[PDB]
Design a protein around this ligand. Structure first.
Ligand SMILES: CCCC(=O)OC[C@H](COP(=O)(O)O[C@@H]1[C@H](O)[C@H](O)[C@@H](OP(=O)(O)O)[C@H](OP(=O)(O)O)[C@H]1O)OC(=O)CCC
Length: 134
């Protein structure tokens, strides 16, 4: 675009506040948007799809399964697309991880009300398995 750019004023704050990592010091910036939008065009996806939250949902759905079966060059874009959606859905996130959760919870909710119910689970092991911070 061009008219007052794409990013807003009040929104630019929260956007510039979000950090790429939970324990890092890097914050999202136009630089990351260019690297992301540039990937879509090349891959085959459009760029305007990053403007509408609805379009972003069609992207995360494809990159979703690409995470557990793809390279880092892809997972990187998947992390950004998750944040772009949180910006248009008025969703607030502290870091990139938080955005990945909120978005996911919103997708599984739509892809879990037709015929994709969860299966039986298993109890924890007797051995020592207590290691993890909040
Ligand atoms: C010329 C090659 C360099 C290049 O292209 O640069 C890649 C660009 C910016 O550079 P970077 O800060 O090194 O990249 C990110 C940080 O190291 C972050 O700490 C790491 O952790 P997490 O966020 O995953 O926890 C990210 O991992 P993946 O998401 O890739 O696994 C990594 O991408 O990545 C972006 O941020 C773009 C938007 C996602």
């Amino acid at each position: 675009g061009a008219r007052n750019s794409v990013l807003r004023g009040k929104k630019a704050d929260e956007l510039e506040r979000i950090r790429l990592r939970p324990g890092g010091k890097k914050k999202y910036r136009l630089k990351h948007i260019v690297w992301a939008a540039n990937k879509l065009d090349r891959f085959g996806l459009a760029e305007s799809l990053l403007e509408s939250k609805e379009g972003c949902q069609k992207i995360l759905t494809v990159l979703d399964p690409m995470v557990p079966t793809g390279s880092e060059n892809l997972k990187s874009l998947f992390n950004t697309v998750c944040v772009i959606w949180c910006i248009h859905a008025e969703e607030k996130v502290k870091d990139t991880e938080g955005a990945k959760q909120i978005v996911r919870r919103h997708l599984v909710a739509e892809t879990g009300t037709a015929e994709k119910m969860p299966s039986t689970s298993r109890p924890t092991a007797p051995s020592s398995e207590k290691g993890g911070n909040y």
